[PDB]
Design an enzyme around this catalytic site. Structure first.
Site, short mmCIF file in Angstrom:
data_model
loop_
_atom_site.label_atom_id
_atom_site.label_comp_id
_atom_site.label_asym_id
_atom_site.label_seq_id
_atom_site.Cartn_x
_atom_site.Cartn_y
_atom_site.Cartn_z
N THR B 179 0.78 -1.36 0.29
CA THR B 179 -0.09 0.05 -0.05
C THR B 179 0.81 1.33 0.10
O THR B 179 0.47 2.47 -0.18
CB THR B 179 -0.88 -0.10 1.18
OG1 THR B 179 -0.07 0.24 2.50
CG2 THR B 179 -1.83 -1.22 1.40
N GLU B 254 8.56 -23.61 24.90
CA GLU B 254 9.29 -24.68 23.87
C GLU B 254 9.64 -24.07 22.81
O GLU B 254 10.44 -24.68 21.94
CB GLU B 254 8.22 -25.78 24.10
CG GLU B 254 8.77 -27.06 23.68
CD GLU B 254 7.72 -28.30 23.95
OE1 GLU B 254 7.34 -28.25 25.19
OE2 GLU B 254 7.63 -29.10 23.43
N1 LIG Z 1 -1.30 -11.35 4.61
C1 LIG Z 1 -2.06 -10.19 4.70
N2 LIG Z 1 -1.39 -8.91 4.72
C2 LIG Z 1 -1.96 -7.78 4.94
C3 LIG Z 1 -3.20 -7.66 5.48
N3 LIG Z 1 -3.76 -6.73 5.29
C4 LIG Z 1 -2.57 -5.56 5.12
N4 LIG Z 1 -1.42 -6.53 4.89
C5 LIG Z 1 -0.26 -5.84 4.65
O1 LIG Z 1 0.11 -4.90 5.49
C6 LIG Z 1 0.83 -4.03 4.79
C7 LIG Z 1 0.53 -2.51 5.47
O2 LIG Z 1 0.44 -2.81 6.87
P1 LIG Z 1 -1.14 -2.63 7.49
O3 LIG Z 1 -1.41 -3.52 8.61
O4 LIG Z 1 -2.27 -2.82 6.24
O5 LIG Z 1 -1.14 -1.18 7.99
P2 LIG Z 1 -1.96 -0.89 9.61
O6 LIG Z 1 -1.12 -2.02 10.38
O7 LIG Z 1 -3.23 -1.07 9.58
O8 LIG Z 1 -1.17 0.50 9.99
P3 LIG Z 1 -1.66 1.86 9.38
O9 LIG Z 1 -0.52 2.66 8.53
O10 LIG Z 1 -2.24 2.95 10.40
O11 LIG Z 1 -2.89 1.70 8.40
C8 LIG Z 1 0.62 -4.15 3.32
O12 LIG Z 1 1.94 -4.16 2.77
C9 LIG Z 1 -0.14 -5.50 3.16
O13 LIG Z 1 0.70 -6.31 2.49
C10 LIG Z 1 -4.22 -8.97 5.33
O14 LIG Z 1 -5.14 -9.01 5.71
N5 LIG Z 1 -3.30 -10.34 5.06
C1 LIG Z 2 4.06 5.69 -4.89
O1 LIG Z 2 3.37 4.91 -4.43
C2 LIG Z 2 1.94 5.32 -3.88
C3 LIG Z 2 1.50 6.31 -4.52
C4 LIG Z 2 0.13 6.48 -4.13
C5 LIG Z 2 -0.39 5.83 -2.94
N1 LIG Z 2 -1.84 6.36 -2.60
C6 LIG Z 2 -1.84 6.55 -1.33
C7 LIG Z 2 -2.85 6.57 -3.36
N2 LIG Z 2 -3.66 7.47 -3.03
C8 LIG Z 2 -4.78 8.13 -3.56
CL1 LIG Z 2 -5.73 9.25 -3.07
N3 LIG Z 2 -4.98 7.24 -4.97
C9 LIG Z 2 -4.04 6.56 -5.27
S1 LIG Z 2 -4.32 5.65 -6.81
C10 LIG Z 2 -2.80 4.64 -6.56
C11 LIG Z 2 -2.52 5.13 -5.45
C12 LIG Z 2 -3.12 6.06 -4.69
C13 LIG Z 2 0.20 4.81 -2.39
C14 LIG Z 2 1.66 4.40 -3.02
#
Ligand SMILES: Nc1nc2c(ncn2[C@@H]2O[C@H](COP(=O)(O)OP(=O)(O)OP(=O)(O)O)[C@@H](O)[C@H]2O)c(=O)[nH]1
Ligand SMILES: COc1ccc(N(C)c2nc(Cl)nc3sccc23)cc1
Ligand SMILES: Nc1ncnc2c1ncn2[C@@H]1O[C@H](COP(=O)(O)OP(=O)(O)CP(=O)(O)O)[C@@H](O)[C@H]1O
Ligand SMILES: Nc1nc2c(ncn2[C@@H]2O[C@H](COP(=O)(O)OP(=O)(O)O)[C@@H](O)[C@H]2O)c(=O)[nH]1
Ligand SMILES: [Ca+2]
Ligand SMILES: [Mg+2]
Ligand SMILES: [Mg+2]
Lengths: 53, 437, 268, 427
Positions: B179, B254
């Site tokens: 993300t 363990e």
């Molecule tokens: N395997 C698995 N990975 C997840 C899932 N949800 C999020 N992730 C991984 O978590 C990463 C981002 O961390 P998140 O846990 O989603 O973020 P957060 O813990 O809510 O922390 P925030 O930044 O406040 O949103 C991403 O790169 C995803 O690959 C899930 O449901 N399953």
């Molecule tokens: C460089 O990597 C990136 C660039 C952007 C994002 N995020 C937060 C976004 N936020 C909104 Cl509002 N729209 C869109 S569309 C695709 C991403 C995206 C995440 C990672």
């Protein structure tokens, strides 16, 4: 190849097999968590003071 | 009987926590209302599943779990979901402003405002425990909450629960499903700050889970739901010894003993077999030898890496289903001849084996086929350091230009915490290298 | 268009391979550190295998087999031969921890070694390049001993006898062929060495794939009996054969992954 | 997580009004604030932009600002003009005469507090304010001069909220007055310091697209604003709709802005379409991808091959294969890797939403943080000095109390921004 430590129960069993043998404090945390909040407050005070200029 | 408290942090940790608790209820015959017709001791008991469930006077089985996120969106789905009645409202803790993919925002600015509340809700579960074993902490490396708040929480748990074991289920970042561009920063920061507070950590690389879903489940583009059901089968394999009767990995200590002879090298590699699509109408059931052999194929590992070019310090085989010790030893003997399995010189060349006769449970309507026998291998191999190499490189490319550091410094972090965290990782990669050549 | 990066600028062999790749108009060279490559002609030491095959949307290939150093370093090879049951403690490796009657070319009473170039592709086919080379020594004397090209520092141009002349020699002098008297033994030795380590280094179920070029150095004795001296993992070719071999490396190892024959396939 | 929307001056209010027309239609709110929608994806995150009222009326969280009553009258007469909360119309009577100084220092100062009172009322009733979004032009007086005055004061009162702008850059091909380069340069100096993200909406690029691609021989502001609203709807998709990436203004800033001052984005859109004429063949995902990265689809009139992409955010709208979208996005980066900085791993991120915009079965919106944006600022710098070296038209500004020195600082800050963008084009 030696089997050892075998434990059996009605749910399953476990055991071992050897192929070959061998040959911070709460106050320190409070300090750094608050050091960070002061750097944040300081930088925000530079923003508002510059905006006051 | 000693209890275990599960803590789920951030989006990954919560959504993975839901998958696990759904599966745990199915395996133990606990329905979405928390009722367990098979518990004849109404209102209590010191049975194995009580390690993970407390019982109410009214016969309800309640997970020993707290879900924590810095934003309400995801935990709100638990509050309204099919298993809502399972969790006491006090166990679902929500903020208003999430961490914005920023470790410093989760650890310092927003984290410091909610840490005290979380630790008290945790204290509430500890207080219903007759002897608390420790904690299972679920979280992503990549999120601002998963990385930043988790490490803040792990520090406090060490202070408030010094004698208690802490284990981790950590989602390592993969670009196919990530993300944020800064996930490498948050990973190193959270690993550095947490390393000393964690006794054992099972990493799951989303890249591995993703390809397994594409290759073996024929899912063209797996979603978080696809990944979490597969991930929860693996976590269930790892925790089955704490919730069922047996003699292998019966308590959290363990896990260290059997898998982590040296404290900092405490990331066992998990390999899981067999993964079979529910869509395959005709499936030839795999023998003990075939599923055991599959534990040494990199395409079934939770992290892609090559154990042939590393060294083993420990190795456990967790079978579920129609498995007897003779077939296992037969399987091992032939696998040993045909595979590059090198143990460090100061460790015996051996496998600790655990067999549960209950074959794996599958979520009705899920993607996983029911199978007659399955195995989860936990091996502590230096090969997993390849994942650290990958991550530290990505970190190095961005940090050399200080790209994005101002978002961290802007929250109160100092530039030197970056390099300090990076140095720890340099020491870690060096540790794996000394233990593996 | 496929993309590749070059990380060992001292390889004559893959310098020519880069030259060939570009001239197809279907390969573009990226920068050393760009990770979005299909192909890595990698560095000779500390090659970063742990960072290959994690590039979604890219099939990745590299010109080295992780783990093949065991074959290709003086002390590892002897360790591998003595310990691996597939190569017993073995009729064709000199006892290890001099070959006192070598075969000697006439005229000159000279001493020599045979280099064979072998290419192992990502599918673990073993391809022996048909062109070998003997390294001559401009007169052998007990009590011009080390046939190394530089050490010998001129009979045959550059102190190299290729296989046609050497075969003509074996027929005239010894009444036999290069195929029957030596090459059966060489193909056997190559096949045994590479079949031995195949489980350790194969990339058949791996997320990245490898091929690699080896240089096998052999020593023929007075009974027309072959011995393995050294295996070289970063070899160079002879100028006469560069063009063909490098073109072969592209057809067999690179175009096969990213789309009559000068190689002998050693079937196993 | 509420966003507060502010639209200032003539351009700001005109494209502001279009934005609210377009996304309201996307969320199933009619001009009277009533929801008549099909899907429930339409209301999940509807509170990000809309406030709740009795009768389940949805009211935009929008503040309309201008020193001139005429354009706000036209908005009130527009299609959705009755959806806006009437107390959120804040206007003066004297106009700004296309003068940044009147908007920033004399006329705008008279009115800015009344605007801040409305902003405060909206903020005080948010669970968690993400920050603000301002639409304005940089070439006039109100949106440019008063808009940047508003940003400066909003930052003082909300220093921890995100400030985001849609800023229309002036072009001599769509030009009201000769002093636009002056107004734009003074504003860019403000934006560099006081916004977290600004979308560079270039009237030169919008003009060239209407003329060359859409074949409109005499483009109007109406034809320009059709492009602007398609862009504005696209780039906010991940803020307004639920998906795998639930985005907000801070997560956009964090992942798009590697260094604080380099926060000026090139928006892109595909397919490019003209008002009224709909074409009936949907694009293939490979076509969306190629057109969206094509320089002829950029709204900022910079050749992307003249720079490098620091980061890219893409969003695909409509019913389509996410596998094909992933492969096609991976394809463009692997085939063009030299145009993406190597020191930001995986700097391209793609989102997908099922609801397409009105009239399209499939669209792709592009948000680029490219070092080629410097071309925009150089263009404006050249036009500024061509006049400034002779101090031409300055009396309009010294008449309001401004000093030449102020112009020198602004021009020099903009030249610094250009240098900094050039710094990273080569690393
Ligand atoms: N395997 C698995 N990975 C997840 C899932 N949800 C999020 N992730 C991984 O978590 C990463 C981002 O961390 P998140 O846990 O989603 O973020 P957060 O813990 O809510 O922390 P925030 O930044 O406040 O949103 C991403 O790169 C995803 O690959 C899930 O449901 N399953
Ligand atoms: C460089 O990597 C990136 C660039 C952007 C994002 N995020 C937060 C976004 N936020 C909104 Cl509002 N729209 C869109 S569309 C695709 C991403 C995206 C995440 C990672
Ligand atoms: N056991 C043996 N009996 C006879 N001659 C031998 C021998 N071992 C080596 N030689 C000869 O002496 C030379 C010693 O050189 P060495 O084998 O160390 O070079 P090398 O093969 O490492 C050079 P390159 O890597 O360029 O091929 C050999 O090339 C061979 O000609
Ligand atoms: N794209 C577009 N640009 C506009 C529109 N109206 C004005 N502009 C631009 O804005 C500049 C004039 O500033 P303006 O907003 O009208 O002055 P203001 O009333 O003080 O805000 C001109 O250079 C125009 O190019 C519009 O409807 N669409
Ligand atoms: Ca009981
Ligand atoms: Mg979250
Ligand atoms: Mg005007």
């Amino acid at each position: 190849m030696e089997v050892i430590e075998l434990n059996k129960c009605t749910s399953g069993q476990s055991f071992e097999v050897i192929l070959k043998p061998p040959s911070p404090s709460l106050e320190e945390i409070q300090k750094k968590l608050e050091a960070a909040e002061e750097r944040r407050k300081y930088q925000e005070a530079e923003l508002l003071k510059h905006l006051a200029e | 009987m000693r209890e275990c408290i599960s803590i789920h942090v951030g989006q990954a940790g919560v959504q993975i926590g839901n998958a696990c608790w759904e599966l745990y209820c199915l395996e133990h015959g606990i329905q979405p209302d928390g009722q367990m017709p098979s518990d004849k001791t109404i209102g209590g008991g010191d049975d194995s599943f009580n390690t993970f469930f407390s019982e109410t006077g009214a016969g309800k089985h309640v997970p020993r779990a707290v879900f924590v996120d810095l934003e309400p969106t995801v935990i709100d789905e638990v509050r309204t979901g099919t298993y809502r009645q399972l969790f006491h409202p006090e166990q679902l803790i929500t903020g208003k402003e999430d961490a914005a993919n920023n470790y410093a925002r989760g650890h310092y600015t927003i984290g410091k405002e909610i840490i005290d509340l979380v630790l008290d809700r945790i204290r509430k579960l500890a207080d219903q425990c007759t002897g608390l074993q420790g904690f299972l902490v679920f979280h992503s490396f990549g999120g601002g909450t998963g990385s930043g708040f988790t490490s803040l929480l792990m520090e406090r748990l060490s202070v408030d629960y010094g004698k208690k074991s802490k284990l981790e289920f950590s989602i390592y970042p993969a670009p196919q499903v990530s993300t944020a561009v800064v996930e490498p920063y948050n990973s190193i920061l959270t690993t550095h700050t947490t390393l000393e507070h964690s006794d054992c950590a099972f990493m799951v690389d989303n890249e591995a889970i993703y390809d397994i879903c594409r290759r073996n489940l024929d899912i063209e583009r797996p979603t978080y739901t696809n990944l979490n059901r597969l991930i929860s089968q693996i976590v269930s394999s790892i925790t089955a010894s704490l919730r069922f009767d047996g003699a292998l990995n019966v308590d959290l200590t363990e896990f260290q003993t059997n898998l982590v002879p040296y404290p900092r090298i405490h990331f066992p590699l998990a390999t899981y077999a067999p993964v079979i699509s529910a869509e395959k109408a005709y499936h030839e059931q795999l023998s003990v030898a075939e599923i055991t052999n599959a534990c040494f194929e990199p395409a079934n590992q939770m992290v892609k890496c090559d154990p042939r070019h590393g060294k083993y310090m420990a190795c456990c085989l967790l079978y579920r289903g129609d498995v007897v010790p003779k077939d296992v030893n037969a399987a091992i003997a032939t696998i040993k001849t045909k595979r590059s399995i090198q143990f460090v010189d100061w460790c015996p060349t051996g496998f600790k084996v655990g067999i549960n006769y209950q074959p794996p449970t599958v979520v009705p309507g899920g993607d996983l086929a029911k199978v007659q026998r399955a195995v989860c291998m936990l091996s502590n191999t230096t090969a997993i350091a390849e994942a650290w190499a990958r991550l530290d490189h990505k970190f190095d490319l961005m940090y050399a230009k200080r790209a994005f550091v101002h978002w961290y410094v802007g929250e109160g972090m100092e530039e030197g915490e970056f390099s300090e965290a990076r140095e720890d990782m340099a020491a870690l990669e060096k540790d794996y290298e000394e233990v593996g050549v | 268009m496929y993309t590749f990066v070059v990380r060992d600028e001292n390889s004559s062999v893959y310098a020519e391979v880069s030259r060939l790749l570009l001239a197809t108009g279907q390969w573009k060279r990226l920068r050393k550190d760009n990770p979005r490559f299909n192909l890595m002609l990698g560095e000779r030491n500390r090659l970063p295998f742990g960072r290959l095959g994690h590039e979604p949307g890219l099939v990745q290939l590299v010109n080295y087999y992780r783990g093949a150093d065991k074959l290709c370093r003086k002390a590892s090879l002897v360790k591998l031969i003595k310990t691996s049951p597939e190569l017993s403690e073995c009729t064709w490796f000199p006892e290890s921890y001099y070959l006192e009657k070598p075969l000697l070319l006439e005229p000159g009473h000279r001493k020599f070694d045979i280099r064979s170039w072998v290419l192992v592709d990502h599918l673990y086919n073993i391809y022996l390049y048909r062109e070998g080379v003997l390294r001559t020594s401009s007169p052998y004397n007990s009590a011009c001993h080390l046939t190394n090209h530089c050490i010998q520092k001129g009979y045959e141009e550059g102190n190299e006898m290729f296989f046609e002349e050497f075969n003509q020699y074996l027929m005239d002098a010894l009444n036999t062929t290069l195929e029957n008297s030596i090459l059966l033994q060489i193909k056997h030795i190559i096949r045994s060495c590479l079949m031995c380590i195949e489980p350790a280094i194969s990339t058949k179920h791996l997320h990245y794939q490898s091929f690699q070029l080896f240089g096998f150095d052999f020593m023929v004795d007075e009974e027309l009996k072959v011995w393995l001296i050294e295996v070289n993992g970063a070899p160079a070719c002879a100028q006469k054969l560069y063009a063909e071999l490098c073109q072969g490396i592209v057809d067999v190892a690179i175009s096969s992954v990213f789309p009559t024959s000068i190689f002998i396939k050693l079937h196993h | 997580r509420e966003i507060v929307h502010i639209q200032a001056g003539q351009c700001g209010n005109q494209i502001g009004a279009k934005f609210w027309e377009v996304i309201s239609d996307e969320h199933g709110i009619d001009p009277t604030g009533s929801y008549h929608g099909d899907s429930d994806l339409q209301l999940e995150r509807i509170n990000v932009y809309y406030n709740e009222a009795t009768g389940n009326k949805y009211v935009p969280r929008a503040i309309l600002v201008d020193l001139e009553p005429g354009t706000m009258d036209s908005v009130r007469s527009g299609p959705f003009g009755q959806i806006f909360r009437p107390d959120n119309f804040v206007f003066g009577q004297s106009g700004a005469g296309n003068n940044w100084a009147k908007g920033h220092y004399t006329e705008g100062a008279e009115l800015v507090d009344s605007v801040l009172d409305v902003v405060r009322k909206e903020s005080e009733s948010c669970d968690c304010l993400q920050g603000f979004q301002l639409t304005h032009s940089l070439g006039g007086g109100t949106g440019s001069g008063m808009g940047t005055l508003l940003i400066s004061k909003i930052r003082e009162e909300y220093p921890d909220r995100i400030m985001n702008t849609f800023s229309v850059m002036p072009s001599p091909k769509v030009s009201d007055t000769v002093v636009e380069p002056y107004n734009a340069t003074l504003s860019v100096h403000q934006l560099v310091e006081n916004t977290d993200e600004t979308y560079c909406i270039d009237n030169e690029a919008l003009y060239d697209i209407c003329f060359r691609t859409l074949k409109l021989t005499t483009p109007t502001y109406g034809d320009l604003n059709h492009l602007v609203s398609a862009t504005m709807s696209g780039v906010t998709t991940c803020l307004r709709f639920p998906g795998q990436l639930n985005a907000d203004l801070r997560k956009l800033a964090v992942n798009m802005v590697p260094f604080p001052r380099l926060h000026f984005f090139m928006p892109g859109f595909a397919p490019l379409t003209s008002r009224g004429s709909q074409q009936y063949r949907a694009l293939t995902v490979p076509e969306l991808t190629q057109q969206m990265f094509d320089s002829k689809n950029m709204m900022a009139a910079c050749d992307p091959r003249h720079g490098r992409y620091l980061t890219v955010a893409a969003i695909f709208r409509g019913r389509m294969s996410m596998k094909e979208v992933d492969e096609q996005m991976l394809n463009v980066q692997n085939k063009n890797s030299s145009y993406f900085v190597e020191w930001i791993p995986n700097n391209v991120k793609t989102a997908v939403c099922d609801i397409p915009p009105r009239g399209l079965k499939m669209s792709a919106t592009f948000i680029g943080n490219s070092t080629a944006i410097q071309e925009l600022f150089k263009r404006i710098s050249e036009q500024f000095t061509a006049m400034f070296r002779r101090k031409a038209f300055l009396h309009w500004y010294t008449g309001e109390g401004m000093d030449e020195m102020e112009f020198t600082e602004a021009e020099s800050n903009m030249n610094d921004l250009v240098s900094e963008y050039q710094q990273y084009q080569d690393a």
